[model samples]
Target: ALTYRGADISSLLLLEDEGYSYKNLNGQTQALETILADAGINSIRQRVWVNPSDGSYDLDYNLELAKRVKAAGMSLYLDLHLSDTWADPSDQTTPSGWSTTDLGTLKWQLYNYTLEVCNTFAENDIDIEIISIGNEIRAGLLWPLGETSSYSNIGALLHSGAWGVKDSNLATTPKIMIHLDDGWSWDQQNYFYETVLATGELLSTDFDYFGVSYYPFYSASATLASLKTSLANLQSTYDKPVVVVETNWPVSCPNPAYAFPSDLSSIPFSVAGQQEFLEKLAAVVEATTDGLGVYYWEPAWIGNAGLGSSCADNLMVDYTTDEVYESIETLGEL
Candidate 1:
């Protein structure tokens, strides 16, 4: 089914089946290893959860996926959301049982969980290229306790996570990325780091670059100069690379009109506005000298077919109407 947004873009071609059909640790995979080898996508990034009931991202399940990914000759990147379920910036709350735990316990869990994950991957001879300490952990991880707008606790939690990665010793020992949302403005980027650093602690103790997630609606009309200035500041201050680990914008796709969940104000409408937005973003990224790369968060969110059933119920990718706002195609087009 075509997405509800009514855009005339081919989603499959944009994504090119990077990691969709592969099965983890179940001794099965949907596609042949040669198929991926032929595609030239040499890396497979997988998520790991503490304890998952579905067993999809659990260690056992991941080993299955890892074996297939390696068999296909692709390097692996382990994205640790640190939570049992999805843990984007908007919802990186601590897991059900962990929330009740104290700061000390949370830190211990963070370190132990990360170490165990890496050790397991190591034991299996899996080569992990990069390790995202926590998924979209803008406010910090093992949350509620490590909540943002504060630095001391957030820094501690990050240190703990980093320590876990360091102790794991995965041969190459994947580069650590501290991820956060609000990728547009230099100030939001500045303030977030400022808070984390001001807690009277040195953050350089554990990670490499600052990973940012950029979405237009979240950060509106940030000038190109501002973007450059921000990246420069981030690089100079932290002495680390600035990478847009996740970023996306809508191309010709129009924003949909739906009941405003929180406030019944006018729906945020755009089409050409979206096009201009991408142009500006490309300029911003191109201008960054230290810019590593940008991964379209879920650019392949073609309607809801390729995603979970919950996506449709939550109206995440509406093929029924324009309510679905997919990322604008910018890979080769850029």
Candidate 2:
């Protein structure tokens, strides 16, 4: 079976602290983690930002969430944002402390940072199933030094991040990933992967899977048809499995820009439609060569916005209360 049925619940703590309460299908109060596990989610992905101002998405926050995940009998998929805040295709800002360092020094600094995060999780007895080196790095990461044209620099940092995870020596080895954004684009993704994973080349970085963020509403190229093609092409070219690391569809209040496929037109904009979307997507993923499965971006996040994409995530749970939507009952299943 394709692994990794999960969602990025990085906002769990914030929701909890804000007095949000999750409910079971029976309408009884429950912890969100418990409710999610009941929904068949066996994995949970969390993002970690370096020294976040509000302490959100930082090390301690992740460790706490990791414990809760373990308690729910789920594996953790850790995402290292490598920034003080968000890191995406458009912006991969250097963290607060690494701005002034030279290339080599910056690599060492990143390694040490990665090492500490991994080791601390190990010390807490958490076994991470997967860890993405940087979130959506299609445009490049760590900025100017690690920008797209400077292939060698990004490759070096990728090497450093993977090595840091390896050196931490967790009980069970974790799969390493370099997540990219949009269609997992034939343009940026193809060029970026070719450059970083170039065979027999200096500073070429090797890792487990190709992670992609595919939010259909955001880009014209981000549709399911595009996603299926992107996954097929990337795996064929690189011989690496691809995981749709981030994606979502609103069950209601769909933004005007959303160009959902006509193929899936029958599934209305509601909870049932959400389930149909994911189930259909899962089969699309399984149809690929070792497509590892998808992770809904911030399905548990509350409030007016989401973490990695625009529009509402009324797909899985209610934002106001952690109530499990009908679609989530078979969340991790195809």
Candidate 3:
């Protein structure tokens, strides 16, 4: 059993595949879920971005997919990026309608919108296991409106969402997750906690896990050992279960760039190096006083379609086939 924040959690997962084309590989899409179920992945986490013009990732699409995930008996963790498009710390622009509203109204809107989404899922009997109110909110979500720089705004927005989740009243207590860019950065971690604590709020009361993303190169570590040291430090500093939320090493790509705009350096461009990074990271978590779980970022995204590998990491690609490589070594020894 994995113990996180005094809570023992374990998965008999039917690993859910991220957005991908499994048809060619399986000659069918439905069987993919069955195979993963047999392999022991009991839950699935799917991302849901607000209204996007693109037919993909829309509510209709997600609802349909959630059905499949539910039918497989795997719980669903809905990652809600409150943007009409992709949402992240770097740029979490408010929706067009919300962009003009004052903070008070905006806070209400955040809560209401989140509630609407949750209620829809619950009503449909979709097992919404967890809800990420914001995506990679290190810098702050919704920017000037609710950016990390202004802790008060962040807290207000988050508190409202917590209320919404509570009101959902599902059979299980829905969880809340706040994702940050670097899971191993104690500096960022402390800043966020300090902000929350200064407001007289405890993380354990409202949030389920400390969701962090670990991209080694961005942490400025030349090697995985440095990453390990930082992760171990995080566990000691904060008495919370750490979830390596969004982490991935680029397997292969024709050209790669980091998260920054017109600024990319410090990330390593080797898949093997990334493998080593994750291995050491896992070891650190396994040794931690309150270890929880780790989700390899976008290990499945490939072919220049997904987010860039970010400053120091490289997406892995088999030079021979120009396709993504899925080496067991990358996931772990189990």
Candidate 4:
């Protein structure tokens, strides 16, 4: 529906706990949620880890944030990592709570865990619109047994997560999104979905959206044009709505986060650059057959924590000032 205009504030609570004062367009102090609403952000994305060493992005923390998101009248897009910590292309380590030698035991554990999280959110009055099975799962999740090569295992775990949402006690069923990284590479994306789909491990009905991450800076060859083409290709192949579920435009160079290089001249590492990038991004997405939405990942994460500096330059707020870029409001206009 081209409805989502969101910011993944997965790190908001951590920033707030650091006494961060989010300001509105006029520089008046306000709640972060208020600022997001004023920016015309219609949805909020929060990432939840099964267990984190720092006690951040856990179920309870996101519950509190999602409550604020709902209170502010925005849709909730929950991203479950299904890991004790970060789960992505590099590593998808299994959570310690679900540790086991047998894959069979792990599958049910994942299922029940997903069921529990969905039920808990429903109990808290959160109407989750889209609940992703895992975060940027290009390499698959739950590691070792569930990696991408293990198509059946990956499919089993993902299906379990999806079933958890479909069978939840929530008043309304949430759309399931199966996320993968590398939005710009057609070969990688094609090979992944084709191989997985061919195996019959997961069916088309398993997920509603073909979610991909787009960080133009992540590769020298990955341009805006490449991303648009890939979205069209993905939509054509799957007949499912495609979404750039994750992206972040860096305002500075030498970013600790992953951003490789680029041939795209219309974009760069700056505030106005991010505005331009997102504006063009949405325009191209709307031009696609079933391009649904886009999200700015961890925009509020600034240069406070040791791990924060990694994406500090790539954040929505100015790391130097701790105030959000006024230009970020451009996404709503698209």
Cα lDDT of model 3 by residue, 232-278, tens digit? 66656665566665555544334433242111233344666556655
lDDT of 1 by residue, 1-334 (tens): 1000111111222233443333212334435333333433345556677676766466776677678767877666667878888887667767656744588898888888888888888888887767788887666666678777546888888888888878896887788887776665777778777777777543665788776765434323533455567777788877887765554433322332232222212223343434344445555665666665444444334444323211122222233332323223223233
The regions of model 4 sitting more than 4 angstroms off are 254-263, 266-268, 304-312
| lDDT (Cα) of model 4 | 0.80
Candidate 4 lDDT over 233-316, as tens digits, reads 999987999888887766765544454544455466677887888887888899999988888877777653223335446666
Total backbone collisions, model 1: 10
Candidate 4's displacement at residue 298, Å, is: 1.5
In model 1, the Cα lDDT at residue 308 comes to: 29
Name the regions of candidate 2 deviating beyond 4 angstroms.
199-205, 261-266, 305-315, 319-322
Looking at model 3, report the run of 10 residues with the lowest lDDT sum.
5-14
Candidate lDDT (C-alpha), each: 0.57, 0.79, 0.58, 0.80
Task: Show the colliding residue pairs in model 4.
Answer: 217-260, 218-260
TM-score of each: 0.70, 0.93, 0.76, 0.93
Q: lDDT tens digits, residues 20-123, model 2?
A: 88788888999988988887877888999998788888999888888999999998899999999989878889998895359888899888988888888888
Please give the distance, in angstroms, between residue 149's alpha carbon in candidate 4 and its true position after superposition. 3.2
